[PDB]
Amino acid sequence: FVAAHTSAGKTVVAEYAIAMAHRNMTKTIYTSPIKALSNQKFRDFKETFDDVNIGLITGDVQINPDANCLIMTTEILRSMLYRGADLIRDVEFVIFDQVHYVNDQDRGVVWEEVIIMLPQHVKFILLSATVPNTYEFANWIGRTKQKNIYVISTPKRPVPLEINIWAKKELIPVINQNSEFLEANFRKHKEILNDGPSKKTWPEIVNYLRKRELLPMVVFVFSKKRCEEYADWLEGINFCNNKEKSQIHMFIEKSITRLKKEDRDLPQILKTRSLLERGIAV
RNA sequence: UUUUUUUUUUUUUUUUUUUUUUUUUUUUUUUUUU
Numbered sequence: 001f002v003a004a005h006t007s008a009g010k011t012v013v014a015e016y017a018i019a020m021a022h023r024n025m026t027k028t029i030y031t032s033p034i035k036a037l038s039n040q041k042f043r044d045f046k047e048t049f050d051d052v053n054i055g056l057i058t059g060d061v062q063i064n065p066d067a068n069c070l071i072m073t074t075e076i077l078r079s080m081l082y083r084g085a086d087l088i089r090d091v092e093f094v095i096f097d098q099v100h101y102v103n104d105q106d107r108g109v110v111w112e113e114v115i116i117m118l119p120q121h122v123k124f125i126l127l128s129a130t131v132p133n134t135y136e137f138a139n140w141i142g143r144t145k146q147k148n149i150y151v152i153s154t155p156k157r158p159v160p161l162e163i164n165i166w167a168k169k170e171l172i173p174v175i176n177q178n179s180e181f182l183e184a185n186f187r188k189h190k191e192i193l194n195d196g197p198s199k200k201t202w203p204e205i206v207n208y209l210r211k212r213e214l215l216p217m218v219v220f221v222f223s224k225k226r227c228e229e230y231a232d233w234l235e236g237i238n239f240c241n242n243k244e245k246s247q248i249h250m251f252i253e254k255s256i257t258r259l260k261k262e263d264r265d266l267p268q269i270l271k272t273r274s275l276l277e278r279g280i281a282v
Numbered sequence: 283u284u285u286u287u288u289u290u291u292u293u294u295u296u297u298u299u300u301u302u303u304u305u306u307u308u309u310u311u312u313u314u315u316u
């Protein structure tokens with residue numbers, strides 16, 4: 001059982017498990033609560049491993065069912081166990097990623113049933129983040145399956161984070177990398193300021209951070225409509241000089257070939273293409 | 283105003299003909315128009 005901070009390198013354990021299974025000529029099953037992550041992990045594993053066949057089993061697709069490495073959803077595994085598939089006899093490792101996202105009601109019963117129904121020759125690898133309820137999951141699994149499981153945790157984040165506040169064309173650091181609040185900086189922030197964004201607000205930020213070599217930016221707006229307005233407010237700003245635009249255009253043109261000819265003229269596609277040529281997206 | 287994609291089961295034909303069942307009897311010479 002591994003419970004480490006985010007961006008600490010949890011995927012190294014899964015890669016080593018897959019390599020061990022390939023060396024022993026056994027099978028591995030990878031499972032995630034969310035179907036969105038399955039495709040991304042499938043692509044990542046296909047790129048990373050060249051001597052190992054990778055498969056995918058979801059409610060929409062089914063690629064290489066006979067491969068030695070399979071990525072599927074929890075309900076797919078539940079149905080497979082209920083049917084009594086013959087490939088389970090060769091499975092050595094089952095990996096559950098993002099365990100801390102399974103504390104829901106619909107996601108909870110299927111996970112417990114899958115854990116209960118698994119045979120005794122299968123070993124477990126568990127990955128998640130730091131959550132208050134960590135020892136209980138491991139204890140329950142080790143009691144139900146009567147197996148030895150080790151709980152491994154990390155002290156702190158390998159990369160540190162800081163919290164700042166922006167006000168009137170400069171940035172005030174108020175929490176440092178040690179998670180210690182700075183009262184004087186907050187007081188100065190209160191003093192210097194003595195509603196919503198304006199039309200000349202996002203340009204005032206896309207230039208200050210650009211000159212500081214901190215360009216890669218993700219802005220969180222809690223509204224579908226406000227994001228489009230904010231993106232449209234950024235006018236006369238570009239990040240592709242002459243070849244990045246051509247490469248992006250080629251990638252977009254090749255990608256949307258799978259659609260029909262009259263389905264590529266939709267306004268959303270045109271607006272996204274126009275925005276993507278300058279390095280801005282929603 | 284963020285957040286929400288749900289869809290159950292089955293495999294390759296029973297063996298020996300046509301028959302296919304009820305109310306009681308008689309007597310000695312051609313041809314046409316009559």
Ligand SMILES: Nc1ncnc2c1ncn2[C@@H]1O[C@H](COP(=O)(O)OP(=O)(O)OP(=O)(O)O)[C@@H](O)[C@H]1O
Nearest residue numbers: 004005006007008009010011012097098127128129
């Ligand atoms: N010991 C290490 N030293 C240097 N780099 C490392 C080390 N371990 C992992 N990395 C790098 O970390 C990068 C990404 O880390 P990773 O994706 O595993 O974080 P994570 O914990 O899985 O995030 P999440 O919470 O989303 O699951 C990898 O590309 C890897 O090169």
